[PDB]
Amino acid sequence: EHASTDQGKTVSRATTNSKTESNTAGVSVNVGYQNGFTANVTTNYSHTTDN
Amino acid sequence: EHASTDQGKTVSRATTNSKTESNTAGVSVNVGYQNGFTANVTTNYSHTTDN
């Protein structure tokens, strides 16, 4: 907790991030399109401030 | 038969004089959080002598 590195154990990994991944995770494909609504719907719509 | 009856009586007196000399040395390491991250290192050494 306090002033590690000469205290305990660490593990550290590099990452990437996506500003819209949390948005498109609520998309199911459902191969059929009904009445020319050639688009999908998310269960939750998040903005680009949600990494 | 031969029958005996002995009785005794002792009186003793002992005096001791001791003298000890002790030395101590230690290190105390402190890390914590108090309105920010802190750290201390204490180094003490003591000398006792008793008679």
Side-chain angles (χ1 to χ4, degrees):
Chain A
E1 194 173 18
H2 323 305
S4 327
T5 326
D6 287 272
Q7 278 303 326
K9 306 182 117 183
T10 20
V11 75
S12 110
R13 283 177 185 150
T15 62
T16 34
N17 58 91
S18 183
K19 301 157 177 57
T20 59
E21 160 157 40
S22 135
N23 204 152
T24 69
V27 175
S28 39
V29 283
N30 66 39
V31 58
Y33 296 111
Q34 313 294 271
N35 303 349
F37 180 70
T38 58
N40 303 321
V41 174
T42 43
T43 40
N44 79 315
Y45 181 99
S46 25
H47 299 270
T48 61
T49 78
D50 302 5
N51 273 68
Chain B
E1 294 173 331
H2 295 270
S4 312
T5 32
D6 305 318
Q7 61 188 342
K9 210 204 67 198
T10 34
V11 166
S12 158
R13 156 72 150 272
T15 332
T16 325
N17 294 87
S18 324
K19 176 188 168 305
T20 313
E21 305 262 349
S22 143
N23 292 100
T24 323
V27 186
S28 206
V29 167
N30 191 348
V31 294
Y33 181 88
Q34 176 177 31
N35 279 114
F37 288 73
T38 74
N40 307 313
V41 179
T42 323
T43 305
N44 54 89
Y45 71 84
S46 167
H47 171 76
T48 313
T49 298
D50 36 332
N51 300 77

